[PDB]
Amino acid sequence: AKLTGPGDKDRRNKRKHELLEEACRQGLPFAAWDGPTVVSWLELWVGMPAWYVAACRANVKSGAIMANLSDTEIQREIGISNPLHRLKLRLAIQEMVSLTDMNHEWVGNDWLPSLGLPQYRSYFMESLVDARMLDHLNKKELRGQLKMVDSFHRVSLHYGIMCLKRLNYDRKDLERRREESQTQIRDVMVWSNERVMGWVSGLGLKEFATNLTESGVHGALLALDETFDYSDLALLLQIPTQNAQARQLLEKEFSNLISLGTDRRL
Amino acid sequence: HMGSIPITDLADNIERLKANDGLKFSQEYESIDPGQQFTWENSNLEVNKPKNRYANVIAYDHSRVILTSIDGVPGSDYINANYIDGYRKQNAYIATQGPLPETMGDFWRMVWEQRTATVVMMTRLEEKSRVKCDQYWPARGTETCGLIQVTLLDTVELATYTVRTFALHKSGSSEKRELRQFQFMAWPDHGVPEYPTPILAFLRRVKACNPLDAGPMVVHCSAGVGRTGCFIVIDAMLERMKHEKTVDIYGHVTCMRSQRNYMVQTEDQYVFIHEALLEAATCGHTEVPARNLYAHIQKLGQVPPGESVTAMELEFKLLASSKSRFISANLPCNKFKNRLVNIMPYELTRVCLQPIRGVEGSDYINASFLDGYRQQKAYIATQGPLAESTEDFWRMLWEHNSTIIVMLTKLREMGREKCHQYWPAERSARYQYFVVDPMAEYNMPQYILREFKVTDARDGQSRTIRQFQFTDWPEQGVPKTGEGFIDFIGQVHKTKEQFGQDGPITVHCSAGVGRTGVFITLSIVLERMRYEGVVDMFQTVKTLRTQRPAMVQTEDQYQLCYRAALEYLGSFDHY
């Protein structure tokens, strides 16, 4: 960016932290905040689109009203008919009350592809799914709205989330752990789809590794699921059944992988 | 002309060459002759033959680029490449073939030893399932090609070209060199480009970024003689124009043939060079840095000496001055599918629907693909749907994964229909194969947002399609300020990003050219101004008009674009 202004990313990010600082400095609990205060909160910290914040500017006069807003009241005063958008909101206001980064862009552009699930990017982002919402996803919400009809992908998703909880949602810690496991066969729970593909081609199976793209195969699944053996992985690599040598290298090396880099009972 | 031409006589000369099925062009092109014999002993050596992509495209010995010899390895000095003189610049370019898998190390070592700062790639890696060149740069990180260690630092993808920045390291040395690569993306799979506007943009970008104190610029394509030749001669002749206001294409190609075989290897390419330079001679220079925009607009509103209207008007007239392209649009079976019978899509860039068996013209809709700042086919510009074309309209959005619509009119204005209500208001509706459900509707000061749930009745898959309707466009003339419209353009694109909608943005007004032009023009210009700090209005509209006729239809609409750009600028720090 050659020209800079208040519309930049870091400018809006600093103003966000400055309004928050101003809130927690003045001492006001969430329920005491003004009208203008909660609508600048919706834009900047929650990240709602302008049409939501317009309906909030016209219908919510205080944080007290907002906090007590029922599910059906949200739909008619803020205008949010989207259930996952509501969820984003209820968790947001809930977090603020109890307290008085990893947003949907991160989930969509970073996390999801590392799970080997990039296809679902559009739907997750359209629904504004941040990290905070992941454990609160219904089976109905996954199947329908987020289009995950493949049950394995929901499982793949499930173990991805479990991994995040194992790491207390620390993105910095996650990224570091991934870096330190690039060259060794240790702690595969943190392994991405790349790293797994990178592992597979290292065994001498370069011709199948690319077939793990959009497969939902990632390290957290291998490490946390006991029902997942080499045969599951074999057909996800689209390995010919008659190919006995491959299904040998894979089986042996899959055993080395789990034994050396997980805590699984096999 | 077999010699120098003043640029004022260029158009007339091109006309004479074109006459009688271009008899004169052929005779001239066929007569090009260096008038000497050459040798290519090094290219024919048994060890170097595999280093030639085409056996019949070789490097003349006197002008070939010689690499340093590697002890113990015969043929270490060879790469299929030759120096090419530029305008008043000796060995200004290096024409080479696109590297083979086994000459990639040689290729990079040439770049090092020649102290090259800029590589120009005139091809995509693959065109029509045919390999034109092998990828020789790392997609990510650092790779080692022979003795050179290549590191990808930065990539910038724009619609017609990509820029990559590399850092080079040679083994045994602590020296670090920077190298930028410019890849051209808008050369068709067959023949020459229909328009010279994109290639001219590319050259201007390259001239701007190639340091004045570097080694020769490497230019390559497939064999390094065709597209490579065209780039080089246009670049040289642009410089000659800048200095002498003449051109000697025939002269320069002749000299180039003394350095490498077949430079400019087809006649249509020879013609393309002429046409490109005619466009450059005609359009002048219209880019202005943000710093100078205010004064520039003041200046455009003035009437030059000996003229009758403002520079703005003249500039606008010039957009039209650079003119059977409506084939499907004129088919009897499709005429009623055009809201205005005189506003039709170009055949090359029109949006096509999957044909339906037995129904002639079921593949047609009055809509064109338009390029964005960063990607091609970023916008679909179409007319305000007719009731006749509503079913087709929904089918277009589905077949082309467009999930954001932009409406720039009311349903009726001035007592006439601008657009049919193609969407359900209160209850569901079935439009042939598709079921459209009204999900929500949000009223904002200067626009309305409508969300739909579209379902394919064939398999049951569904998408959310969103429509942004602008309500504050005056039914006579243009907005006094662009404040509201700029914000609208921001919201539409902010939505595309925040919701991860990868498909095109469908834009419509009445005929799909006036207000739609303004929307798309400003979408590109405002982003380019934010990231490059420059404004090229004329070039932006002129590019658009090569993809759909008459984009930005009236001068007050053009005036509006300038006015809005200045307003957007005011919202930045320095300004």
Author numbering:
A (entry chain E): 806 to 905, 951 to 1116
B (entry chain A): 1328 to 1650, 1654 to 1905
List sentences quoted exactly from the publication behind this structure:
By participating in both cell–cell and cell–extracellular matrix (ECM) adhesions, LAR-RPTPs play critical roles in mediating axon guidance, neurite outgrowth, as well as synapse formation and differentiation. Liprin-α proteins, having four vertebrate paralogues, liprin-α1–α422,23, are well-known for their scaffolding function in synaptic development and activity. As the intracellular effectors of LAR-RPTP, the liprin-α proteins interact with the catalytically inactive D2 domain of LAR-RPTP via their highly conserved C-terminal three sterile alpha motif (SAM) domains.
Finally, we successfully obtained high quality crystals of the α3_SAM123/LAR_D1D2 complex and determined the crystal structure with a 2.85 Å resolution. In one asymmetric unit, four LAR_D1D2 molecules were assigned with essentially the same conformation, which shows a small change of the orientation between the D1 and D2 domains by comparing to the apo structure of LAR_D1D2. Except for the insertion loop connecting the SAM1 and SAM2 domains and a few short loops in the SAM3 domain, three α3_SAM123 molecules were modeled, each interacting with one LAR_D1D2 molecule to form a 1:1 complex with the buried area of ~1100 Å2 on both sides. In the complex, LAR interacts with liprin-α3 via the D2 domain via two conserved binding sites, site-I and II. On one hand, the C-terminal residues of the α3D2-helix in LAR, particularly Q1828 and F1829, are inserted into a cleft between the SAM1 and SAM2 domains in liprin-α3, explaining the observation that the separation of SAM123 to SAM1 and SAM23 abolished the binding of liprin-α to LAR. On the other hand, a Trp residue in the SAM1 domain of liprin-α3, W856 puts its bulky sidechain into a hydrophobic pocket formed by the β8–β10 sheets and the α3D2-helix in LAR.
